[PDB]
Amino acid sequence: DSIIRFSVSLQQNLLDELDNRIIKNGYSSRSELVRDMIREKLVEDNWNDESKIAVLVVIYDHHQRELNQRMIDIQHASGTHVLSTTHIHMDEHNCLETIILQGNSFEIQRLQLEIGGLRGVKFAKLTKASSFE
Amino acid sequence: DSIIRFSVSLQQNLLDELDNRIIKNGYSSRSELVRDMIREKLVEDNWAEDNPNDESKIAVLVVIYDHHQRELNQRMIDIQHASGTHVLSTTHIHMDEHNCLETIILQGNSFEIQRLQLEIGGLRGVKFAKLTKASSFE
């Protein structure tokens, strides 16, 4: 306990989104909102190298050059095993994909990290479900 | 350059838990992890607060339940039918005798979707019920 402060680096639009939300919801500062976002994401992260089942929801631009190959290459090296996938064409530029996969905590978390950072991927949320053999 | 830096005051207790995930999960920095959490929450916020009555919102419901307990599935279908949402797709994976994992892709306004998730979560035999909000980007 105590209080320590560290610096956070953002691009403009993430900052814009954050400041817009602060103003609408009557939050007092950036420090408070981020603090509450950290404390919440930490708690909701719910899960030994035992294999598990999880769900990865991805939203991306379908006409992006070789993005699918990019995602395939990533999950092939991931060590995870894919069970099922569904592709929803939400929009002209938006594709929703749900992926049911199994692996250990680390591979599954890592798969989300790498898929999230690809250009053309705008959303990549992981739902940790349960132990699974 | 193109990057803005601002300061976050915080409990050492909270800082340590955050630093643990960075090390545990192989994150490059605090900023990248914090950025990612913020961006996830901010997006989900906008999903529920802009055009709240838009019927074209899409979300994914992930449920784990016992499928060999009586009336549970029917009860769940009853609930979905009164929700006012539309099911786009569903997948069931039978994990074992007492556990089934299904993904449901929904469409409706934020209220209907959030009430559906709530009614299904409260069910006896439904062990797990978690919703992801899917939004269209420009």
Swiss-Prot record, chain A:
Pfam families hit by this protein: NikR_C, RHH_1
Protein function: Transcriptional regulator.
GO terms, molecular function: DNA binding; DNA-binding transcription repressor activity; identical protein binding; nickel cation binding; sequence-specific DNA binding; transcription cis-regulatory region binding
Record family assignment: Belongs to the transcriptional regulatory CopG/NikR family.
Entries under InterPro entries matching the protein: Acetolactate_synth/TF_NikR_C, ACT-like_dom_sf, Arc_rbn_hlx_hlx, CopG, CopG/NikR_regulator, Ni_resp_reg_NikR, Ribbon_hlx_hlx, TF_NikR_Ni-bd_C
Cofactor(s) listed in the protein's UniProt record: Ni(2+)
Positions with a binding annotation for Ni(2+): H76, H87, H89, C95
Entry superkingdom: Bacteria
HAMAP family in alphabetical order: NikR (MF_00476)
Source taxonomy: Bacteria, Pseudomonadati, Campylobacterota, Epsilonproteobacteria, Campylobacterales
Subunit organization: Homotetramer.
GO cellular component, one term: protein-DNA complex
Alphabetically ordered keywords of this record: DNA-binding, Metal-binding, Nickel, Transcription, Transcription regulation
DNA-binding among keywords: yes
GO biological process: negative regulation of DNA-templated transcription; regulation of DNA-templated transcription; response to nickel cation
Cofactor binding comment, as recorded: Binds 1 nickel ion per subunit.
Annotated protein name in UniProt: Putative nickel-responsive regulator
